[PDB]
Amino acid sequence: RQEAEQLKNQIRDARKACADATLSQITNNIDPVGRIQMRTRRTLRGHLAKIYAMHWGTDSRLLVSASQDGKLIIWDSYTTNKVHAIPLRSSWVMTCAYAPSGNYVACGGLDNICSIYNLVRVSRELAGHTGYLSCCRFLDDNQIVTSSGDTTCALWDIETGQQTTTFTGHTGDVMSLSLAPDTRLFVSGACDASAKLWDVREGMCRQTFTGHESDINAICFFPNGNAFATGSDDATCRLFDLRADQELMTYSHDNIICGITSVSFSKSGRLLLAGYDDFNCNVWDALKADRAGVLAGHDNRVSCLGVTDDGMAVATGSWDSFLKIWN
Amino acid sequence: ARKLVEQLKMEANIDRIKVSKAAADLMAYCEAHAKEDPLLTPVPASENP
Amino acid sequence: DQRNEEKAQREANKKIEKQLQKDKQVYRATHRLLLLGFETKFQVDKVNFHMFDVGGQRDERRKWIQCFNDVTAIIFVVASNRLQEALNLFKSIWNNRWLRTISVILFLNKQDLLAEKVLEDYFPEFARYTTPEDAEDPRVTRAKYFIRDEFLRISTASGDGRHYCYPHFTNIRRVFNDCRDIIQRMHLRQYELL
Amino acid sequence: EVWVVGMGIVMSLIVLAIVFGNVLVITAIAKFERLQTVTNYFITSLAVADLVMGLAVVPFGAAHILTKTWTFGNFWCEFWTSIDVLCVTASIWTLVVIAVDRYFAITSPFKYQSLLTKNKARVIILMVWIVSGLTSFLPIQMHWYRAHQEAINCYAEETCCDFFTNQAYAIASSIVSFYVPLVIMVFVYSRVFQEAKRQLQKIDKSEGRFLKEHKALKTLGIIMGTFTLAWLPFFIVNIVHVIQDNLIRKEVYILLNWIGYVNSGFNPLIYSRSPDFRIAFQEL
Amino acid sequence: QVQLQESGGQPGGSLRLSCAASGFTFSNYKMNWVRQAPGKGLEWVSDISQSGASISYTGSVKGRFTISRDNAKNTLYLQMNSLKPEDTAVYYCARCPAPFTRDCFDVTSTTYAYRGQGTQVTV
Ligand SMILES: CC(C)NC[C@H](O)c1ccc(O)c(O)c1
C-alpha cells in the first residue's frame, strides 16, 4: 500500500544523483555528416498482402519475410529470386525469425503458436501461450526468446517442447524485443511505457526504465552492449542506458505526429534508423538529432525494418507487399 | 502489491556510473568503428551489391 | 561454376512464381470477415467467405485490431449499462485511423429479449422519442428502434461516403446480400458516381 | 489571308493541348507504380491511341488546310488515311472496354477481382488494337475502298490527298467505328446508372434523416454526353455523303470531322477522376 | 513516469474531484473519467476532448455533472452537482493511450496499473 511508495523515491533520488550532464551538452564535437540518402537497390515484389514483419538473415543475404497472406517467403537479396515459399496454417503472422546458423526459420503470430521451420515442413509447434505473439528471436538452434501479449516473455526449448523460464510480470501487453551481442540478456518494450531489461541466467528483472508517455511499439539494442534505443507511439525515439539507468536524448521534431513502428541501429551505432507511420522512415543521428534524411518510398506504412549482420543494406518493409533494399 | 514491494529492493542494490562516463563509451564506439560503416561511409561502386 | 549457379535458382525462381500466381486466384476470391464481440469458411453461390474470429485474445484491443485493416466487413455483434460499454467500442472502431475505410455490419441481438423485459431505458433522450414506422407492437418498436437509431447516430457524423453501418435485427444470406452491397458501393465511390 | 492566319494558331493549339495533357497519363502511370492496377492499363491505351492522333494525325491535319497541298505526296496519303482510322477506331473502342470494365464491376461484383487479372488485360487491348487495325490497314492499303466519278481522277493521280470512300467502305466500317460503340456504351450506362440510383435509394431508407442526385448525372454527362456530342455528328455526316449528296457544303466534312479530334483532348481530363491521379500530378 | 493522482472526497449534496498529470504533455490527450461501483465491473461516466469540445456522458449521469479540463495546470475537474444514491463508486481517472486521436479503449479490466487509486465517492 503506502509502504512501497517511499522505496520508489529512493530510486528517483539515486537516478537523478548520477545525472552529471547530458549527451546534448558533452557532444560539442565534429559536425554531423550532412544530408545522406539511399535509393531502392532492389524491390522484392512477391507478396499478396501487407508485410507485417521481416528479419534479415545472419548470412547477410537471405532475408525472410512474413506477410498476412499466409506466405513466408525466404527471399534472396542478391539475385532477387525466391529460395522457398512456405505456406502457413493460420493466415496471420506478426513476426518471423532467423537462426544464426542459417538452418532454421521460426515464424508465428496471432494464432498464439510459435512454429518452427527448417529451410518447408514444420518441426515443433511450441504452443502454451494465452495471447498473441509479437517478436521471436533465436539464441541457438534449440532456444528462442519469444515475446507474447500475455505480459510474459518466455524461453522455450525446441527439444520436447518445454518452457524453461517465464519472465513474468509486466502489467501490460508486451511488444517487440531485442537481444544483446553476448546473448545472455534481453530487453522488452511493452504497452506500459516501460522498457524492462530481463536476465536469461537468473530469470527475473535486472532494471526497469521509464521515459515514455505512451505505449512502446518496437525496440532495438546498441551494437556494443551498453545501451538501447526505444520508439513509442508519441513520435519519439528515446535512447536509454545500462550503466547510468537514465535516458539521454529524445529524438523528436515539431511536425511529426505519427508513432514509431520499428527501430534498428547501424553497424557502428552512429545512425539510428526509425520506421515511422507517415509512409516514410527517418535516419536519426545518435549523437545529435539532426534527421539527416527523409528517405521516402512506400505508400502505405513502414511496418518493419532490419539491418544486416555486416551493416550493408537495410530492408524496410511496407503495407503494400513491397520490400525495398537501401544501400 | 505484496510482490512489487520486494522487487524494487532488488533494483535498489545495484550501483551505477554517472552519465558523463556511461555515455563516454558510446562516443568511443561511434568514432573508432567509423571505417567499417558502409551506410555512413559510402563504399566504392566496385564492391556494393 | 558461374553458369550452373544462375540456373540453380532460376529453376526455383520460375517454379515458385508459377505457383504463387496459381494461389493468387484463391486469395483474391476469399472474402475476409471478423466476428467481433477459430476461423470458419462458408460459401454462398460460389464465393468464398474467410470469416475470422477473436475468441482467445484478451480484452485489450488496440494492437490486434490494426491487424484487421484489410477486412471487408467487421461483423459487430452486440446485445440489446451493457450497451454503453459496447458503444464506445463502436465509437472507437469508427474514428480509428486504420479501421477507417472498413464498413461495419451491425447485428442487434434477439428481439424477444427486448420484448419480454418491457412487458430500464437507461437513456435521457428516450421519453421524447418520435418513433418511425415500417416494423411489431408500439411498446416494443419504440424501444428496439432506439438503439438502432443510437448506433446510427454516430455512423452518419463520420460517414464520408467510404464506410456505412448496415444494421440488421436477428442468416448467412443476410450477410451475402450485404457483403455484395459493400463491393458495389466501394466501386461506385471511386468512379465519382455515388 | 487573315482567315487562314487565325486558324494557324487555334488548330495548332489542338496539337499542343494533346501532348501537354496526354503525357501526364504516360509519365504518371509508368512511374508511380501504386496506381498501376488492372484498370489503369486500359487508360494507358487511351494515351497511346491518343498520342498517335496528337503527333501523327492532328499536326499533319493542319498542313493539309494551311498550304492546301499534301507535301508528302502519294504512298503516304494511303498511310496517313490509314493511321487516322487506326487512331479513331482505337480511341473509341477503348472507351467501350473501359465502360464494360465498369459494368462488370458493379453488375457482377463478386466475379471481377478474381476473374480479370493483368495477364488478360493485354489480351483485351490486343483484341481491340487488332480490330482497329483490321479496318485501317487491311482495306485502306490493299485498296478495297478505291471506288467512280472523281474517285479515280485525284485519289491516285497527283497531290489530291483527300478521302473518297466507296459505297460500302463508309457503311461497313462506320458501323464498327461508331454505331457498335453506341449500343454497347448505352447498354452499359443504363445498367450502371440503374445501380447508382438504387444505392442512393437504399442509403436514404436506413440513413436519410440525419435533389442530391446531380452527382450521378454530372459524371454521366461528362462521360456519356461528351462522347455522343463530339463524335456523333462527325459520324452522321460520313453516312450521308455516300448515301446522298445534299449535305456536301465543302466544310462540313473537314471542319465538322475536326470536332472529333478534340474529343481526345478531354479524355485525360475525364478518365483521370480517380483520387490516385489527382495526387500524382502535383509532383510533375 | 505517468503519474495519475486523484484528490477530493447524504444523497443530494455536491462534490468536486481534482486530479494531476505529471510526466506527459496534457494539451493533446483525450482524458476521461471511469467509475466502478463495487461488486460489478467498470462502467463509463464522462469524456473530455483535446480542447473542451466533445463533452460526452453516459446514460444516467447525463446533465447532472459537469466536467472541464484546465490544460494549464495539468488538471481536469469533475463537478458533481446533484449527486445520487446510485453513485457509490470509486472513480479512476483514465487516459487516452495515443496523442492526437479520436478513439479510446480505456474501459476494460486491470491491464493498466501504473496510476493512482482514485478517490472513493459514497452517498
Ligand atoms: C478523312 C480521314 C482523314 N479521316 C476519316 C475519319 O477520321 C474516319 C474515322 C473512322 C472511320 O471508320 C471512317 O470511315 C472515317
Interface of E with A in 34-63 (CB under 8 A): none
Q: Could you tell me if C155 and C165 are in contact, meaning their C-beta atoms sit under 8 angstroms apart?
A: yes
CA of D234 to the centre of ligand 1 (A): 9
Domain of C182 in residue numbering reads as 31-189
- How many angstroms separate the first and last alpha carbons of chain E? 34
Which residue minimizes the CA distance to atom 6 of ligand 1?
D85
Residue E107 forms part of a structural domain: no
Q: Tell me which chain C residues have a C-beta less than 8 angstroms from the C-beta of E108.
A: 59-60
Residue C37 CA, ligand 1 centroid: distance in Å: 64
Residue with cell 492496377: D37
Taking the Cβ of residue C95 and every Cβ of chain E, the question of whether any pair is shorter than 8 Å is answered with yes
Q: Report chain C residues whose CB lies below 8 A from the CB of E113.
A: none
Among partner residues D111, D203, D273, which is closest to C192 by beta-carbon distance? D273
CA distances from A181 to A184, A257, B29 (A): 8, 33, 14
Task: For D85, list phi and psi in degrees, rounded to 5.
Answer: -70, -35
Are D238 and D170 contacting, i.e. CB atoms less than 8 angstroms apart? yes
The CA distance from A114 to A120, in Å, is: 15
Q: What is the CA(D81)–ligand 1 centre distance, in A? A: 7
Decide if C83 is inside a domain: yes
> Residues with Cβ within 6 A of ligand 1?
D 81, 84-85, 88-89, 163, 170, 173-174, 177, 238, 257
Nine-digit cell at C126?
428516450
* Closest CA relative to residue D58, chosen from D249, D265, D220: D265
Q: Which residues contact C93 (CB under 8 A, 6 or more apart)?
A: C36, C65, C74, C76, C99, C102, C104, E103
Verify D-B touch: 3 or more CB pairs within 8 A. no
Q: How far apart are CA A46 and CA A310, in angstroms?
A: 25
CA dist., res. E80 & res. E15, Å (int): 5
Contact between chains at C57 and A173 (C-beta distance less than 8 A): no
Range of the domain at B32: 1-49
Query: What is the number of domains present in chain C?
Result: 1
Place of cell 475470422: C52
Q: Does A149 touch chain C (CB under 8 A)?
A: yes
CATH number at residue A23: 2.130.10.10
Of C47, C157, C166, the CB nearest to D110: C47
Q: Does residue C153 sit within a domain? A: yes
Number of structural domains in chain E:
1
Nearest chain A CA: its distance from E25 CA (Å): 8
Asked if E114 reaches chain A (Cβ–Cβ under 8 Å), the answer is yes
Residue pair A106/A116 in contact (Cβ under 8 Å)? The answer is yes
Is position E109 within any domain? no
Give the distance from residue A275's alpha carbon to the nearest chain B alpha carbon, in angstroms. Answer: 16
Give the closest residue (by CA) to ligand 1 atom 1.
D163
Choose from E58, E64, E95 for mutation: most chain C CBs within 10 A. E58
- How far from the centroid of its chain's Cα atoms is residue A134's Cα? 10
| Alpha-carbon distance values, D45 to A245, D42, D50, E49 (Å) | 63, 5, 8, 51
Distance CA D23, CA D107 (A): 33
CA distance E102 to chain C (A): 6
- What is the Cα–Cα distance from D100 to D36, expressed in whole angstroms? 19
Interface test with E, best of A213, A250, A254, A256 (most E CBs within 10 A): A213
Asked whether residue C21 is assigned to any structural domain, the reply reads: no
Instruction: For residue C194, give how far its alpha carbon lies from the nearest alpha carbon of chain E (Å).
Output: 27
Residue C47 belongs to domain with CATH number: 3.40.50.300
- Output the CA D83–ligand 1 centroid distance in Å: 10
- How many domains in chain B? 1
**Interface contact flag, E2 A193, Cβ < 8 Å:** yes
Structure-block grid coordinates of residue D113: 477481382
Instruction: Confirm whether E108 is domain-assigned.
Output: no
Which residue is associated with the grid cell 495526387? Answer: D279
A150 vs C contacts (CB less than 8 Å): 58
- Cβ-defined contact of C95 to E102 (cutoff 8 Å): yes
The residue in chain A having the minimum alpha-carbon distance to the alpha carbon of residue E23 is A213
* A246 contact residues in B (CB cutoff 8 A): 19
Query: C194 in a domain, yes or no?
Result: no
A1 within a domain of the structure (yes/no): no
Rounded CA separation A150/A128 (Å): 11
H/E element, A300 = none
Count how many domains chain A has.
1
> What sign has the CA pseudo-torsion B43, B45, C2, C6?
positive
* Residue A307, all three cell numbers: 539491418
- Asked if A210 reaches chain E (Cβ–Cβ under 8 Å), the answer is yes
What's the CATH number where E35 sits? 2.60.40.10
Place of cell 519519439: A236
CB C56 within 8 Å of CB A112: yes
* Chain A residues in contact with B9 (beta carbon < 8 A): 7
Cβ contact A214–E99 (<8 Å):
yes
> Crossing angle of helices D199-206/C173-189, nearest 10°?
120
Residues 6+ apart with CB under 8 A from C86: C78, C79
The answer to whether residue C16 is domain-embedded is no
Measure CB to CB from residue C13 to each of A49, A70, A82 and give the nearest one: A82
* Cell 513474468 belongs to residue: A168
Please answer yes or no on whether C67 and A68 come within 8 Å at the CB atom: yes
Task: Please tell me the distance from the alpha carbon of residue C117 to that of residue C101, in angstroms, as a whole number.
Answer: 37
Q: Pocket of ligand 1, candidates D88, D164, D263: which has the most ligand atoms within 8 Å of its Cβ, to mutate?
A: D88
Place of cell 500524382: D280
Chain C residues touching chain D at CB-CB below 8 Å: 21, 24-25, 28-29, 47, 152-153, 155-157, 159, 164, 166-167, 180-181, 183-185, 187-188, 190-194
Residue A232 lies in a domain: yes
C145-150 — which CB contacts under 8 Å span 24+ positions? C147/C80, C147/C83, C147/C108, C148/C108, C150/C83, C150/C87, C150/C123
Q: How many A from CA of D165 to the centre of ligand 1?
A: 9
Burial of C190 (0-12, 13-18, 19+ CB in 10 A): middle
d(CA C46, CA D114): 12
CA of D85 from ligand 1 middle (Å) equals 5
Q: Which residues contact A222 (CB under 8 A, 6 or more apart)?
A: A228, A229, A265, A269, B26, B29
